[PDB]
Design an enzyme around this catalytic site. Structure first.
Site, PDB file in Angstrom:
ATOM      1  N   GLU A   1      12.309  24.138  34.135  1.00  0.00           N
ATOM      2  CA  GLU A   1      11.083  24.420  35.046  1.00  0.00           C
ATOM      3  C   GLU A   1      11.287  23.706  36.468  1.00  0.00           C
ATOM      4  O   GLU A   1      11.895  22.812  36.577  1.00  0.00           O
ATOM      5  CB  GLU A   1       9.756  23.454  34.287  1.00  0.00           C
ATOM      6  CG  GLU A   1       8.461  23.819  35.187  1.00  0.00           C
ATOM      7  CD  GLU A   1       7.391  22.884  34.844  1.00  0.00           C
ATOM      8  OE1 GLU A   1       7.261  22.604  33.760  1.00  0.00           O
ATOM      9  OE2 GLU A   1       7.052  22.095  35.833  1.00  0.00           O
TER      10      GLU A   1
ATOM     11  N   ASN B   1      23.491  23.868  38.887  1.00  0.00           N
ATOM     12  CA  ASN B   1      23.173  23.673  37.536  1.00  0.00           C
ATOM     13  C   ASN B   1      24.244  24.384  36.710  1.00  0.00           C
ATOM     14  O   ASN B   1      24.921  23.994  35.963  1.00  0.00           O
ATOM     15  CB  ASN B   1      21.925  24.263  37.027  1.00  0.00           C
ATOM     16  CG  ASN B   1      20.773  23.102  37.168  1.00  0.00           C
ATOM     17  OD1 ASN B   1      20.590  22.496  36.160  1.00  0.00           O
ATOM     18  ND2 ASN B   1      19.942  23.008  38.176  1.00  0.00           N
TER      19      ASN B   1
ATOM     20  N   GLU C   1       7.692  17.386  29.358  1.00  0.00           N
ATOM     21  CA  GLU C   1       7.816  16.441  29.923  1.00  0.00           C
ATOM     22  C   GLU C   1       7.147  15.130  29.092  1.00  0.00           C
ATOM     23  O   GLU C   1       6.178  14.546  29.554  1.00  0.00           O
ATOM     24  CB  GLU C   1       7.227  16.211  31.210  1.00  0.00           C
ATOM     25  CG  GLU C   1       7.945  17.249  32.125  1.00  0.00           C
ATOM     26  CD  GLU C   1       7.420  17.309  33.636  1.00  0.00           C
ATOM     27  OE1 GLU C   1       6.304  16.571  33.868  1.00  0.00           O
ATOM     28  OE2 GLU C   1       8.047  17.773  34.466  1.00  0.00           O
TER      29      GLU C   1
ATOM     30  N   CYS D   1       9.469  23.851  40.689  1.00  0.00           N
ATOM     31  CA  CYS D   1       8.830  24.576  41.852  1.00  0.00           C
ATOM     32  C   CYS D   1       8.786  23.272  42.877  1.00  0.00           C
ATOM     33  O   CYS D   1       9.100  22.398  42.772  1.00  0.00           O
ATOM     34  CB  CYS D   1       7.317  24.858  41.514  1.00  0.00           C
ATOM     35  SG  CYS D   1       6.391  23.255  41.038  1.00  0.00           S
TER      36      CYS D   1
END
Ligand SMILES: *[C@@H]1O[C@H](CO)[C@@H](O[C@@H]2O[C@H](CO)[C@@H](O[C@@H]3O[C@H](CO[C@H]4O[C@H](CO)[C@@H](O)[C@H](O)[C@@H]4O)[C@@H](O)[C@H](O)[C@@H]3O)[C@H](O)[C@H]2NC(C)=O)[C@H](O)[C@H]1NC(C)=O
Ligand SMILES: *[C@@H]1O[C@H](CO)[C@@H](O)[C@H](O)[C@H]1NC(C)=O
Ligand SMILES: *[C@@H]1O[C@H](CO)[C@@H](O)[C@H](O)[C@H]1NC(C)=O
Length: 497
Positions: free
Chosen positions: A340, A370, A235, A342
């Site tokens: 990533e 995706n 990020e 969550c």
């Protein structure tokens, strides 16, 4: 096949309870004969990847929903699925007794569990650490003579990675990502906050930081671990934000472009680690296609970049077609990979909701979206957390598919675990997404792929309350007559010859 032991904590579904002596598992594949399909079913009501079989018919008649396979329509090849071996995940796994540890690792990595083949490894500390550290905290060590792995790597992460590798029958790909550089390479002299590397790409600060990647890969190789890929930075946009509380290192897309072309790319290419793939972005997909255009239209950066890694946290802002779709159209030979995800980081979200079916559906919905937009893999964040959603030095707690309760030597497998397993278990590396069309408008989420061995796999998610009867047609085999119950997920398998 050892069944789920269900437990409710008052949310929409149950967790499966595991301990030192008992954990739910699968039997080996029986591979049913041509003309028979397998169904794996999970439901909010409590079914957990339950196996059933059914016939394939030569004929179908009716006005019901039909989904037709288009096996000739070939899209992306799958890299794989897995999760992150953070300090927090390692501390939680090692808090269990050894037999409970091994049943947790088998749940993820064995054929008796869900066949994970990816492990993301932070390069030193992140927020899911109990202390802040880098590999080179000795000030102004441009030589990196004092680069070393601390016990978080040598005693926690590395032994657990070795154990995961040994339980897995599939080859496991490791992916490394850094959060921060040593503070003496940064404009702000801090592990967090708004701050970049000092100076400019091609200079001593940038050469030192590139060499740090090579030193990490050397140190892991001394411990008999080799990487599939690294990202250019976790990020990078986060280090551009005033007061950003988590370890970070800010790059503009131009900064990332020049860092890759001048420093990171040539440094990795002139190392024993030249075969290690480099992924750019490792950030929110709203940054596509802009970040891809900035980096990949420079041939000196493009020649080093294997793929583009994306995080899911602002997917609500970022329609897949305008981001993933447009990036695939402009750069079709640069793979897209979800690195990533969550649930629970947002201030209003309860960190951990034991048995949340909603959180499971968020996972499978994201994976289907995706895959329908050319992404080759999907990676969870922490492999395990405690019931508070930590540990975490910033106290930014989140959810995990497995919650460890140290006090009872027990772990809980959440709906997220099963929703991810509906893909990870049944879609190995080399599987190829193929066409799937609907006869009419419908509320289902579905994707079809071909296994390397040529067998079909179809995942059907129903995020609605309503049972949906449907048929699947494969022109090579015939028709599957089935029903997608409200709040269910199915994986269908069948041979095609
Ligand atoms: C680890 O998790 C396991 C799963 O929850 C725990 O096992 C459960 O253990 C309790 C306590 O011993 C068992 O309950 C007793 O069950 C028997 C009846 O046994 C027979 O029938 C049950 C089904 O009713 C079957 O599970 C057994 O195989 C036997 O066939 C009663 O006689 C007692 O009054 C009492 O209810 C559970 O049956 C058992 N479940 C399973 C699936 O094994 C285990 O105890 C946990 N270990 C630790 C230390 O936490
Ligand atoms: C089944 O499909 C075939 C297509 O070859 C069709 O000709 C045949 O009549 C069908 N059978 C029935 C019972 O409709
Ligand atoms: C750093 O490395 C050198 C040479 O290997 C060593 O002599 C020195 O004392 C080290 N510094 C620290 C702070 O550990």
């Amino acid at each position: 096949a050892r069944p789920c032991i269900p437990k409710s904590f008052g949310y929409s579904s149950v967790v499966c309870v595991c301990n030192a002596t008992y954990c739910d598992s699968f039997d080996p594949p029986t591979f049913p004969a041509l003309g028979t399909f397998s169904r794996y079913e999970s439901t909010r009501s409590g079914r957990r990847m339950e196996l059933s079989m059914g016939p394939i018919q030569a004929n179908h008649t009716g006005t019901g929903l039909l989904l037709t396979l288009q096996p000739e329509q070939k899209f992306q090849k799958v890299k794989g699925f897995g999760g992150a071996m953070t300090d927090a995940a390692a501390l939680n796994i090692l808090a269990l007794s050894p037999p409970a540890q091994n049943l947790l690792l088998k749940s993820y990595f064995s054929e008796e569990g869900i066949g994970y083949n990816i492990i993301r490894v932070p390069m030193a500390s992140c927020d899911f650490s109990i202390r802040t550290y880098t590999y080179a905290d000795t000030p102004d060590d441009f030589q990196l003579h004092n680069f070393s792995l601390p016990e978080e790597d040598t005693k926690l992460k590395i032994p657990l990675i070795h154990r995961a590798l040994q339980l897995a029958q599939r080859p496991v790909s490791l992916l490394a990502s850094p959060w921060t550089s040593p503070t003496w390479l940064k404009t702000n002299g801090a592990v967090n906050g708004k701050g970049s590397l000092k100076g400019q790409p091609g200079d001593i600060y940038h050469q030192t930081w590139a060499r740090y990647f090579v030193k990490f890969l050397d140190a892991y190789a001394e411990h008999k671990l080799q990487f599939w890929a690294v990202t250019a930075e976790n990020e990078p946009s986060a280090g551009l934000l005033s007061g950003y509380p988590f370890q970070c290192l800010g790059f503009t897309p131009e900064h990332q472009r020049d860092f890759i072309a001048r420093d990171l790319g040539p440094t990795l290419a002139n190392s024993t680690h030249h075969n290690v793939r480099l992924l750019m972005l490792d950030d929110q997909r709203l940054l596509l296609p802009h970040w891809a255009k900035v980096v990949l239209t420079d041939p000196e950066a493009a020649k080093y970049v294997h793929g583009i890694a994306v995080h899911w946290y602002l997917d609500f802002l970022a329609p897949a077609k305008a981001t993933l779709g447009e990036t695939h159209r402009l750069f079709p030979n640069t793979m897209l990979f979800a690195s990533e995800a969550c649930v629970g980081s947002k201030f209003w979200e309860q960190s951990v909701r034991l048995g949340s079916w909603d959180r499971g559906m968020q996972y499978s919905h994201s994976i289907i979206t995706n895959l329908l937009y050319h992404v080759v893999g999907w990676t969870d964040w922490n492999l395990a957390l405690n019931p508070e959603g930590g540990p975490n030095w910033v106290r930014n707690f989140v959810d995990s598919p497995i919650i460890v309760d140290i006090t009872k030597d027990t772990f809980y497998k959440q709906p997220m675990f099963y929703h991810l397993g509906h893909f990870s278990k049944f879609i190995p590396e080399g599987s190829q997404r193929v066409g799937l069309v609907a006869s009419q408008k419908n509320d289902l989420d579905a994707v079809a792929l071909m296994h390397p061995d040529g067998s079909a796999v179809v995942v059907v998610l129903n995020r609605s309350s309503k049972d949906v009867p449907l048929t699947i047609k494969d022109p090579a085999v015939g028709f599957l007559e089935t029903i997608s119950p409200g709040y269910s997920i199915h994986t269908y398998l069948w041979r095609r010859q």
